[PDB]
Amino acid sequence: GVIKPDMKIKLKMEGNVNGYAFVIEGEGEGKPYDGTNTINLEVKEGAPLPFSYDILTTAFNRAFTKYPDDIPNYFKQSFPEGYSWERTMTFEDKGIVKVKSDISLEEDSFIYEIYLKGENFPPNGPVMQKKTTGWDASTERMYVRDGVLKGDVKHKLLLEGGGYYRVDFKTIYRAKKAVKLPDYHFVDHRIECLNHDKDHNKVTVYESAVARN
Ligand SMILES: [Cu+2]
Ligand SMILES: [Cu+2]
């Protein structure tokens, strides 16, 4: 099959948050059937980033999800042709991130071409002031609507010292060919970072994702 037990990852993100432009490139690897992946990210333009890196990390591929045999796998079926996704993250203080990604496959490597725009973040809020400390673990509700797969998360962005900000995710995942469509289900995520310098010039992200009925 085209999705091997061990796959590699290359990515590029072009982004703009509150007007600040940047480029990030990443290289990594994962185990698509185990639902695990890791990516090493480097800021290539725009360093040091003047905002929270956590609003970028979930943009850095549901092909890396453990799926039970009885739930059709929208993402793995889409290959070799691939899929793309479009996501809106709405923050409780009216900040908003819109991000899109195109996921393709070259040999044994997934390639992500990502574009991200963040706007309307309060200038002295925790995002622009770099006061976040990662994401909680989460549950994404997956469901078919208008012939494509949608995912919703009621997420929590953790704040240094205490508490969190609520962030709603709405994602549309679009296979590039017809695939067998799943019934509604859940994907449980845990995204984490290795300890990093506050400049965030180099960051390693890890994610685990498991689907369940
Ligand atoms: Cu094969
Ligand atoms: Cu950080």
Coordinates of N, CA and C in Angstrom, one line a residue, residues 59-148:
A59 N -1.5 23.3 13.4 CA -1.4 23.3 11.9 C -0.2 22.4 11.5
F60 N 0.8 22.2 12.3 CA 1.9 21.3 12.0 C 1.5 19.9 12.2
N61 N -2.1 16.5 10.4 CA -2.3 15.6 9.2 C -2.9 14.4 9.8
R62 N -4.2 14.2 9.6 CA -5.0 13.1 10.2 C -4.7 11.8 9.5
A63 N -3.7 11.7 8.5 CA -3.2 10.4 8.1 C -2.5 9.7 9.3
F64 N -2.0 10.5 10.2 CA -1.4 10.0 11.5 C -2.5 9.9 12.5
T65 N -3.4 9.0 12.4 CA -4.4 8.7 13.4 C -4.6 7.2 13.4
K66 N -4.6 6.6 14.6 CA -5.0 5.2 14.8 C -6.5 5.0 14.6
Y67 N -6.9 4.2 13.7 CA -8.3 4.0 13.4 C -8.7 2.5 13.6
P68 N -9.7 2.3 14.4 CA -10.3 0.9 14.4 C -10.7 0.5 13.0
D69 N -10.6 -0.8 12.7 CA -10.9 -1.4 11.4 C -12.3 -1.1 10.9
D70 N -13.3 -0.9 11.9 CA -14.7 -0.8 11.5 C -15.1 0.7 11.3
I71 N -14.2 1.6 11.4 CA -14.5 3.0 11.0 C -13.7 3.3 9.7
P72 N -14.3 3.6 8.6 CA -13.7 4.0 7.4 C -12.7 5.2 7.6
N73 N -11.5 5.1 7.1 CA -10.5 6.0 7.3 C -10.4 7.0 6.2
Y74 N -11.1 8.2 6.3 CA -11.2 9.2 5.3 C -9.9 9.6 4.7
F75 N -8.9 9.7 5.7 CA -7.6 10.3 5.4 C -6.7 9.3 4.6
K76 N -6.6 8.1 5.1 CA -5.7 7.1 4.5 C -6.2 6.7 3.1
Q77 N -7.5 6.6 3.0 CA -8.1 6.3 1.7 C -7.8 7.3 0.6
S78 N -7.6 8.5 1.0 CA -7.5 9.7 0.0 C -6.1 9.6 -0.7
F79 N -5.2 8.8 -0.2 CA -3.9 8.7 -0.9 C -3.9 7.6 -2.0
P80 N -3.0 7.8 -3.0 CA -1.9 8.7 -3.1 C -2.3 10.1 -3.5
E81 N -3.5 10.4 -3.9 CA -3.9 11.7 -4.4 C -3.8 12.8 -3.3
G82 N -4.3 12.4 -2.1 CA -4.2 13.2 -0.9 C -5.5 14.0 -0.6
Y83 N -5.3 15.0 0.2 CA -6.4 15.8 0.7 C -5.9 17.1 1.2
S84 N -6.9 18.0 1.4 CA -6.5 19.3 2.0 C -7.5 19.6 3.1
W85 N -7.1 20.6 3.9 CA -8.0 21.0 5.0 C -8.0 22.5 5.2
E86 N -9.1 23.0 5.8 CA -9.4 24.4 6.0 C -9.9 24.5 7.4
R87 N -9.3 25.4 8.2 CA -9.7 25.4 9.7 C -9.9 26.8 10.1
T88 N -10.8 27.1 11.0 CA -11.0 28.3 11.7 C -10.9 28.0 13.2
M89 N -10.1 28.8 13.9 CA -10.0 28.7 15.4 C -10.5 30.1 15.9
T90 N -11.5 30.1 16.7 CA -12.1 31.3 17.2 C -11.8 31.3 18.7
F91 N -11.1 32.4 19.1 CA -10.6 32.5 20.5 C -11.7 33.3 21.3
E92 N -11.7 33.1 22.6 CA -12.8 33.7 23.4 C -12.6 35.2 23.5
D93 N -11.5 35.7 23.3 CA -11.3 37.2 23.2 C -11.4 37.8 21.8
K94 N -11.9 37.0 20.8 CA -12.3 37.5 19.5 C -11.1 37.5 18.5
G95 N -9.9 37.1 18.9 CA -8.9 36.7 18.0 C -9.3 35.5 17.1
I96 N -8.8 35.4 15.9 CA -9.2 34.4 15.0 C -8.0 33.9 14.2
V97 N -7.9 32.6 14.0 CA -6.9 32.1 13.1 C -7.6 31.3 12.0
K98 N -7.3 31.6 10.7 CA -7.7 30.8 9.6 C -6.5 30.1 9.0
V99 N -6.6 28.8 8.8 CA -5.4 28.2 8.3 C -5.9 27.1 7.3
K100 N -5.1 26.9 6.2 CA -5.3 25.9 5.3 C -4.1 25.1 5.0
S101 N -4.2 23.9 4.7 CA -3.1 23.0 4.4 C -3.5 22.1 3.3
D102 N -2.5 21.9 2.4 CA -2.5 20.9 1.3 C -1.6 19.7 1.7
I103 N -2.1 18.5 1.8 CA -1.3 17.4 2.1 C -1.1 16.4 0.9
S104 N 0.1 16.3 0.5 CA 0.5 15.4 -0.7 C 1.5 14.4 -0.2
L105 N 1.8 13.5 -1.1 CA 2.7 12.4 -0.9 C 3.7 12.3 -2.0
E106 N 5.0 12.3 -1.6 CA 6.1 12.1 -2.5 C 6.9 10.9 -1.9
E107 N 6.9 9.8 -2.6 CA 7.6 8.6 -2.1 C 7.1 8.3 -0.7
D108 N 8.0 8.2 0.3 CA 7.5 7.9 1.6 C 7.4 9.1 2.5
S109 N 7.2 10.3 1.9 CA 7.1 11.5 2.7 C 5.8 12.3 2.4
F110 N 5.0 12.6 3.5 CA 4.0 13.6 3.3 C 4.6 14.9 3.2
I111 N 4.0 15.8 2.4 CA 4.4 17.2 2.2 C 3.2 18.1 2.5
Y112 N 3.4 19.0 3.4 CA 2.4 19.9 3.8 C 2.7 21.3 3.3
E113 N 1.8 22.0 2.6 CA 1.9 23.4 2.2 C 0.8 24.1 2.9
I114 N 1.2 24.9 3.9 CA 0.4 25.5 4.9 C 0.4 27.0 4.8
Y115 N -0.8 27.6 4.8 CA -1.0 29.1 4.9 C -1.8 29.4 6.1
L116 N -1.4 30.4 6.9 CA -2.1 30.7 8.2 C -2.2 32.2 8.3
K117 N -3.4 32.7 8.7 CA -3.6 34.1 9.0 C -4.3 34.2 10.3
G118 N -3.6 34.9 11.3 CA -4.2 35.2 12.6 C -4.5 36.7 12.6
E119 N -5.6 37.1 13.2 CA -6.0 38.5 13.3 C -6.9 38.8 14.5
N120 N -7.0 40.1 14.8 CA -7.8 40.6 15.8 C -7.4 40.1 17.2
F121 N -6.2 39.8 17.4 CA -5.7 39.4 18.8 C -5.5 40.7 19.5
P122 N -6.0 40.9 20.8 CA -5.8 42.0 21.6 C -4.3 42.2 21.8
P123 N -3.8 43.5 21.6 CA -2.4 43.7 21.6 C -1.7 43.3 22.9
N124 N -2.4 43.4 24.0 CA -1.9 43.0 25.3 C -2.5 41.7 25.9
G125 N -3.2 40.9 25.0 CA -3.7 39.6 25.3 C -2.6 38.5 25.4
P126 N -2.9 37.4 25.9 CA -1.9 36.3 26.1 C -1.3 35.8 24.8
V127 N -2.0 35.9 23.7 CA -1.4 35.4 22.4 C -0.3 36.4 22.0
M128 N -0.6 37.7 21.9 CA 0.5 38.6 21.4 C 1.6 38.8 22.5
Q129 N 1.3 38.6 23.8 CA 2.2 38.7 24.8 C 3.0 37.4 25.2
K130 N 2.7 36.3 24.4 CA 3.5 35.1 24.6 C 3.3 34.5 26.0
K131 N 2.0 34.4 26.5 CA 1.8 33.9 27.8 C 1.1 32.6 27.9
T132 N 1.2 31.8 26.8 CA 0.5 30.5 26.7 C 1.6 29.4 26.9
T133 N 1.1 28.2 27.4 CA 2.0 27.0 27.7 C 1.4 25.7 27.1
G134 N 0.9 25.8 25.9 CA 0.4 24.6 25.2 C -1.0 24.4 25.2
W135 N -1.5 23.2 24.7 CA -2.9 22.9 24.5 C -3.2 21.8 25.5
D136 N -4.4 21.8 26.0 CA -4.9 20.6 26.7 C -5.0 19.4 25.7
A137 N -5.1 18.2 26.3 CA -5.5 17.1 25.4 C -6.9 17.4 25.0
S138 N -7.4 16.8 23.8 CA -8.6 17.2 23.3 C -9.4 16.0 22.6
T139 N -10.6 16.3 22.3 CA -11.5 15.3 21.6 C -12.1 16.1 20.4
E140 N -11.8 15.6 19.2 CA -12.4 16.2 18.0 C -13.6 15.3 17.5
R141 N -14.7 15.9 17.3 CA -15.9 15.2 16.8 C -15.8 15.3 15.3
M142 N -15.8 14.1 14.6 CA -15.7 14.0 13.2 C -17.1 13.6 12.6
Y143 N -17.5 14.2 11.6 CA -18.9 13.9 11.0 C -18.9 14.4 9.5
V144 N -19.6 13.7 8.7 CA -19.8 14.0 7.3 C -20.9 15.0 7.1
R145 N -20.6 16.1 6.4 CA -21.6 17.1 6.1 C -21.2 17.6 4.7
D146 N -22.2 17.8 3.8 CA -22.0 18.3 2.5 C -20.9 17.5 1.7
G147 N -20.9 16.2 1.9 CA -20.0 15.3 1.1 C -18.6 15.2 1.5
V148 N -18.2 16.0 2.6 CA -16.8 16.0 3.1 C -16.8 15.8 4.6

